[PDB]
A paper describes a structure:
The enzyme synthesizes cellulose from UDP-activated glucose (UDP-Glc) and translocates the polymer across the plasma membrane through a channel formed by its own membrane-spanning segment. Cryo-EM analyses of all three CesA isoforms reveal the formation of homotrimeric complexes, similar to the secondary cell wall CesAs.
The helix has been modeled for GmCesA1 and GmCesA6, while its density is detectable at a similar position but too discontinuous for modeling in the GmCesA3 map. We observe a similar stalk-like extension in some of the trimeric GmCesA3 particles. However, the NTD is only resolved for a small subset of GmCesA3 particles and not resolved at all for the other GmCesAs. Our cryo-EM analysis of GmCesA3 and the other isoforms only revealed monomeric and trimeric states, likely because the region involved in dimerization of the AtCesA3 fragment is inaccessible in the full-length GmCesA3 protein.
Author numbering:
A (entry chain B): 406 to 540
B (entry chain A): 252 to 647, 713 to 947, 975 to 1028
Amino acid sequence: SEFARKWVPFSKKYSIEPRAPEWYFSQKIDYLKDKVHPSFVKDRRAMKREYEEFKVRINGLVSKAQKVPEEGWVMQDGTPWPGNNTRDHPGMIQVFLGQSGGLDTEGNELPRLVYVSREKRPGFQHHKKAGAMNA
Amino acid sequence: EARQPLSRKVSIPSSRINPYRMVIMLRLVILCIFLHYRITNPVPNAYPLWLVSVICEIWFAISWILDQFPKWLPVNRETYLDRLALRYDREGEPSQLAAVDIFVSTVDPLKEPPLVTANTVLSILAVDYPVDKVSCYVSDDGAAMLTFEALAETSEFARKWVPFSKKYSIEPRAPEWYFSQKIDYLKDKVHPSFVKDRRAMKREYEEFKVRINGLVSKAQKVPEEGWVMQDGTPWPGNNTRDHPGMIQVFLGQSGGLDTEGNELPRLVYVSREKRPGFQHHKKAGAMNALVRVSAVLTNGPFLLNLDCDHYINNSKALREAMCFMMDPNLGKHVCYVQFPQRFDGIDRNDRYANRNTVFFDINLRGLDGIQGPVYVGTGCVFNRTALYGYEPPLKPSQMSLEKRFGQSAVFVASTLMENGGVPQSATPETLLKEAIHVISCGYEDKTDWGSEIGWIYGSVTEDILTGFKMHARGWRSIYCMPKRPAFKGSAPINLSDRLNQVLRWALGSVEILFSRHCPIWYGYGGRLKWLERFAYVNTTIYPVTAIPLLIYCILPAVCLLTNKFIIPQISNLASIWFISLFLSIFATGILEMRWSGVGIDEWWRNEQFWVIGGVSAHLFAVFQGLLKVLATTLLIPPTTLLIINLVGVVAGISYAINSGYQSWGPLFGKLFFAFWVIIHLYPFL
Ligand SMILES: OC[C@H]1O[C@@H](O[C@H]2[C@H](O)[C@@H](O)[C@H](O)O[C@@H]2CO)[C@H](O)[C@@H](O)[C@@H]1O
């Protein structure tokens, strides 16, 4: 969401296809085709560098999360992660971007993004993807 | 002391060409013996299948003799750039090199992308030649505003692109092809400040491409009220069919300065006047108008012709041309210098045979040793005197000039300048008016333009006619083959374009055949070499060969269906000649390979491509030419023919099932013949 805060205005303004940064920046197709805006090259270079830094940050997060701590996961706020036990965790819902989630680089709004994890308890069936879709 | 020639004609050493000639003589003798046998020992009586076969064999032998004769004296040419630089381009003194005017032909910005033309102009403006001795003229036949705006933007970008390429000596100097090369760009680089300059130049080129794309997008939609200039005045070329003549100069003496404070080569955009109901002769008329405008403005002694899709790959091409043009002993008798046509991005297998290395490495090399290569359009440097119709010097009148050239006194006076250039005290405001006058639509009336001088008019490809007319006066042409190709272009992507251009070439050839300029009788008693005339007849009457070939291609199928073979009963006295003839053909192919380095792949591709052309496009061109004289589908005959052969093959084996003891022998010979035909017809179909 933090990276989208700056990625979305670029793709919306320059109408790039595809809008997934991994596949857009890894295409051998000439990226200067049907481009009119005079300020496109520098913006594209800055966006590419920002995406590389974002990928580095994601790799760092994955490397940190690779090792499971003995005392359990702890949030950045300091409270323990409620989903410490996958089989016996409650339900959590978090909203990152939306009406009050913040503004992008152009001062507009961003589509609402919600992270949900349904409650899991031992001995209860969950039906996997069908139950996830219903929830 | 300073008498060493600027160039040398190297004869092919007597270790490959002599075996080649001996093998040609042996093949001629064996062809004569085989045909003498074929005339005798007829097929059993009452079989008309043999007369057609021997007639076709006779025609094939005559065609092969006619094609092989102008290949006896191949020569190469080696240039001394250092001697030319020392003799003329001396350091600390003004350059004495002759001025050059480079013409660039374009017609439609929609069909021809403006980026390619911009890259061509950028490569031309960065040539390794003095800026005061280089002029560039771009002829846009469509009178499009997009071309004018693209040329202005191209000049603006060249203002910074030229110093970079000149300083760092990059190759090629076209930014599109230089920046899109996988070759290590840090090779043979010494200057400490090259990396940052290259990065800045790459970014600037990307921004320039973005600007060009924006201009194209703007010009895509035609406004209802018509195009309007940035100044606010309406675009004069609003109607393509009814627009007047316009000439604009972007860079030059007063066009501005580059990033280093020097000058830039002069760039002129010209569009000849177009009016309804008047013929314009397309590229020939455009070239003639360009020649007249350049004579009025700069009057350069030499003119380099180029299309929009061909860029200068080697920056020293002009020096290579001047090595022949400016030689005191040789330059007096030279009409034009021709460079081989090379295309980038060609398929590695080269299905379409777009490379055409046999014509540019064997045919033209052999032609250079007699009188010179034939004119092929792009990438040629012409002398003004030869273009004007003057005869070459022999080796030991106001009304006439007005009638021959035109009613423009300034142009006639310029034609009399032995060293070129424009006379002093000529006001540029009057030079522009004179150039506009000579570019008018109704100028080439009652004159020799397009009939005896300049680009010769007609519905033909026209690049053979002009060179042949120049050669008929005794002029000598030079074939230059630098190690690095001088110019590079783009090959057709689809087979449709290749077939269409082959059909166009064959139609032009058959049109030349039924015309006054046909080499058989035109120029008789002149200063044209007999072997050169033989080669011209060879390259002129070639598509007629299509008519027997088709018949011969029909010969196996009937031979399979009728159950009779073309040759009589097999005999050892005959089989020896057959096998020895086949071996002679293979040996002469091998030797033609070894002395030229063409390769077995390209040689076999050229053979099968000659077959497919004769059966596909040459046949249609001959039919259309005969219809015109008397008064896709191009792929339809040979496919059918191929299918017919295939069908016949199946039928053949059926007869075997019937006849038992007669399954081998004659049927095997028929299958061998059918396999030979279909393997010649293997590509495409
Ligand atoms: O290739 C340019 C040149 O081709 C001429 O036809 C050639 C043909 O290209 C080549 O493959 C064949 O072997 O010989 C013929 C001889 O005409 C064509 O006539 C020219 O207009 C064209 O510029």
